[PDB]
Each structure stands twice: as structure tokens, then as C-alpha cells.
Ligand binder design. Structure first.
Ligand SMILES: *[C@@H]1O[C@H](CO)[C@@H](O)[C@H](O)[C@H]1NC(C)=O
Lengths: 396, 49
């Protein structure tokens, strides 16, 4: 059961007469679905991603400044000028400088001065944005039958099934092996706000940073840096990384305002990360809405022999899961497929079985089946698996 | 001469290509592709099963 691997979980319960359950599935959540006379199911939103989402605006984090050129004129001669002022990839400022005799100039007054600095971006100091397309984004929903098999989070359940929901994907049927069929219809517009969302990406090779951040579209367009679109040759607003020092005769002081990477990372502290599996850009938060069809699921092995009540041992003793459920695993020593004789008793009242199983009709197979999950009332209880027993105290 | 037609009516229908689909008491609604198609008449009902 995948939803034991997570400390966020939900439990959904249908009666014997149920069909088409409606869910919100969230990234890093998981839902266990239960219905009377049906096998229970773990259903989760595995991922939301796109292959190669469209590059939007690039920003420059650190300017590389060069070719500072100055021209200046005496107070009568009007504007000083440079061809730079008209070239691509330059920053310029025009100002008034005090002039006089000995400033190698005819008259005491203010002379026009112009300075221009050539201003490319520093190597690998780009913050690129990407935008999702509702016509190419994939939601992934995963399902597993809630069998008596325990498999770790670094391991895969053989009954695990996967459905991709693109916009071109209609109501999809997954054959849960011997457990029948489940059907899913997840509406890709009944999910994340893809217009409001940018995947912000820096250097992918940065060993001590996130691969990307999930950032708001308006905030990204409000980043106060030089910027350009994909394939554009030169930075808009290159001024934002250059300061000019107050004019001195025939000088105005070009200052590179330094690397703004740490300014960005402070404004990205605690912000949701996004993973980048090569070409796949993954959200790590967000959700989808689905209808799940239970109406073609089957109970496995309801016609199997009850197991020999003597032949059980624990593999894993009754344990609190943190979800108010108790989990355990048993071995069985007959060479058989059989129904596990599981029950639990409120201590001192042996007649009323109080085991609400989460694994319905628990069964041991020729390989697999020993794991059981159940819910119990507060106070002292005894769990039984035939002749095995374990006194269990239930909190709250 | 040849006054403008209004509505045609049919006095005698012709029925062909009848199809039935049924589903057991909790497997949800039975369906046919013919419930979408033009020129079909359909009924949806409950059967004691
Ligand atoms: C999962 O991790 C455990 C502990 O390191 C290891 O024994 C087991 O083989 C791993 N399973 C897989 C399939 O990687």
C-alpha cells in the first residue's frame, strides 16, 4: 500500500451500491478508496509535467561590462556624441559636467558629456523562465490494488497501473489483473492554473541549488533585471545592472552593480521547487480532479479455503501506522493459497469482532499476501490471526 | 404553381437494427453508441435482475 509510505493520506468509503467516485488528487497526497464487497484501491497523482515547455523571458543576473567610451563638449557646443549611442548591446548615459579654462575649454559653465558601456551577460548567469501548455502538459495518475503485499518505497508493486491524462485523453480503463477494471476520467482543466505559472530555471549544473522553482507569472515579469526573449541577440534594460558615477570634467564612472543571483535566491527562499528530469519539467505542488469507476472491480479469492488457524507467525508485529490504522504482516506455513482468519476483540468482550479491515478479504497466495491493515476502537484490544494473537492498545 | 413546403410528417415509421445492452444491479448504466447517433429512437429503463 503506497499510501502507508506517506504521512498525508485520505480514506474514501462507498456503500455496496456505489459507482463513479469523485476525487481531488494532490501531488504528495494519496487516497485509499474503500467500498463494501469491492477490493480497496490506492489512487494518487504521481506527477504533473511537460516535455520542453516554451521558453519565455530570459533574465540576466550579472552584466559583463566593456568598451566604456566617453565624449564631452564645451558649454557653447551643445551635445557630445558617440556611435555607441546607436549600436546594439550598449548602455549609455548623457549628463552635464562642470567645465572652464584649464579644463581645456574656452568658457566656465556646464559641458555635455556622454558615456557608453558595452554590456553582454556574464557566462551562465541567466535566469530562464518556461511556461506550460494545457495542450502538451501530462498529468500522471497511478493506481494499485490494496492487496496483502507490502513493498517498500524504493520498490515497485507488481499490481501498479498508470494512466496519463493529456487534454487528448478520455475515460481510460485500467485492468487491475485479477481485481477486475478501474476507470478514470481526470479533467486537465480541473487542475493547476497554467497561465499563472512559470518554471524559473538557473544553471542546471549548480550542485547546491534546486533545478528550478515554480513562480507566479506576474512576479516573474516584475523581476527588476535586464531581459530578452529566446533567440534575441541583446538585453533589454541593460541599464539595471550598471551605475554611472557623477561626472568629473571628462569622466563619468561606469560601475558594474555585481551579481544579483543572491538577490534572486533570497526572494526564492522557501518557494516550491520544480524537478527537471532532462527534457521533462515537473511541478511538485498542485492537483487534478477525477472520477474513479469502481463498478467493474472484483474481490479476489472469496472461494478459497480458510487458512489453518495454527500455521501463522508474524513477519512484522502489529504496529501503529500514524493514520489510526494498525498494520502487520504474517507468514503462513501451509503450502497453499487461502483466506486469512483475521479478527480483533475489545479486551474482555470476545464475542464482537471489532476489526474494520482496510485490506478486505485478506488472502495468502503461493507468493505474496501476508500484509494486513485494519482500524480498531480506542482502548485495549486483542488482534487475532487464527491462533496468533497480540494485545493492542489503541490511542485516543 | 408549386407553393412552398412547410413541415413533412411521418404517418408510418419503419424500424430496423434494434440493439439492446443491459448491466447488472450495481455496475452502473448500460450504454450503446447508438444513443448518440442520428435517426435512432432509444429507451433507457430498469430491469429486475
Ligand atoms: C530497498 O532498500 C532496502 C534497504 O537498503 C534494500 O534491502 C532493498 O533491496 C531495496 N529494494 C530495491 C528494489 O531497491
Amino acid at each position: 500500500s503506497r499510501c502507508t509510505h506517506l504521512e498525508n493520506r485520505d480514506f474514501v468509503t462507498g456503500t455496496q451500491g456505489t459507482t463513479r467516485v469523485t476525487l481531488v488528487l494532490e501531488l504528495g497526497g494519496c487516497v485509499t478508496i474503500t467500498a463494501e464487497g469491492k477490493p480497496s484501491m490506492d489512487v494518487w497523482l504521481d506527477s504533473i509535467y511537460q516535455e520542453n515547455p516554451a521558453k519565455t523571458r530570459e533574465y540576466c543576473l550579472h552584466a559583463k561590462l566593456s568598451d566604456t567610451k566617453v565624449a564631452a563638449r564645451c558649454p557653447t557646443m551643445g551635445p557630445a556624441t558617440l556611435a555607441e549611442e546607436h549600436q546594439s548591446g550598449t548602455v549609455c548615459k548623457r549628463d552635464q559636467s562642470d567645465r572652464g579654462w584649464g579644463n581645456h575649454c574656452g568658457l566656465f559653465g556646464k559641458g555635455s558629456i556622454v558615456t557608453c558601456v558595452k554590456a553582454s551577460c556574464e557566462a551562465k548567469k541567466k535566469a530562464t523562465g518556461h511556461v506550460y501548455d494545457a495542450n502538451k502538459i501530462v498529468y500522471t495518475v497511478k493506481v494499485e490494488p490494496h492487496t496483502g503485499d507490502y513493498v517498500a518505497a524504493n520498490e515497485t508493486h507488481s499490481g501498479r497501473k498508470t494512466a496519463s491524462f493529456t487534454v487528448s485523453s478520455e475515460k481510460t480503463i485500467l485492468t487491475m489483473g485479477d481485481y477486475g477494471d478501474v476507470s478514470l476520467l481526470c479533467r486537465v482543466a480541473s487542475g493547476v492554473d497554467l497561465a499563472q505559472t512559470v518554471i524559473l530555471e538557473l544553471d542546471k549544473t549548480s550542485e547546491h541549488l534546486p533545478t528550478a522553482w515554480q513562480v507566479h507569472r506576474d512576479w516573474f515579469n516584475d523581476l527588476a533585471l535586464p531581459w530578452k526573449h529566446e533567440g534575441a541577440q541583446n538585453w533589454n534594460n541593460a541599464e539595471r545592472l550598471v551605475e554611472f558615477g557623477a561626472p568629473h570634467a571628462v569622466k563619468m564612472d561606469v560601475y558594474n552593480l555585481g551579481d544579483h543571483t543572491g538577490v534572486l535566491l533570497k526572494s526564492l527562499a522557501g518557494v516550491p521547487v520544480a524537478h527537471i528530469d532532462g527534457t521533462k519539467y515537473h511541478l511538485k505542488s498542485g492537483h487534478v480532479t477525477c472520477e474513479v469507476g469502481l463498478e467493474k472491480l472484483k474481490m479476489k479469492g472469496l472461494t478459497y479455503t480458510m487458512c489453518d488457524k495454527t500455521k501463522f507467525t508474524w513477519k512484522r508485529i502489529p504496529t501503529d501506522s500514524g493514520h489510526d490504522t494498525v498494520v502487520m504482516e504474517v507468514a503462513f506455513s501451509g503450502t497453499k493459497p487461502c483466506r486469512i482468519p483475521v479478527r480483533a476483540v475489545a479486551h474482555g468482550s470476545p464475542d464482537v469482532n471489532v476489526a474494520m479491515l482496510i485490506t478486505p478479504n485478506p488472502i495468502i497466495e503461493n507468493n505474496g499476501g501476508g500484509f494486513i491493515e485494519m482500524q480498531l476502537p480506542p482502548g485495549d484490544n486483542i488482534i487475532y490471526v487464527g491462533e496468533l494473537s497480540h494485545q493492542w492498545f489503541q490511542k485516543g
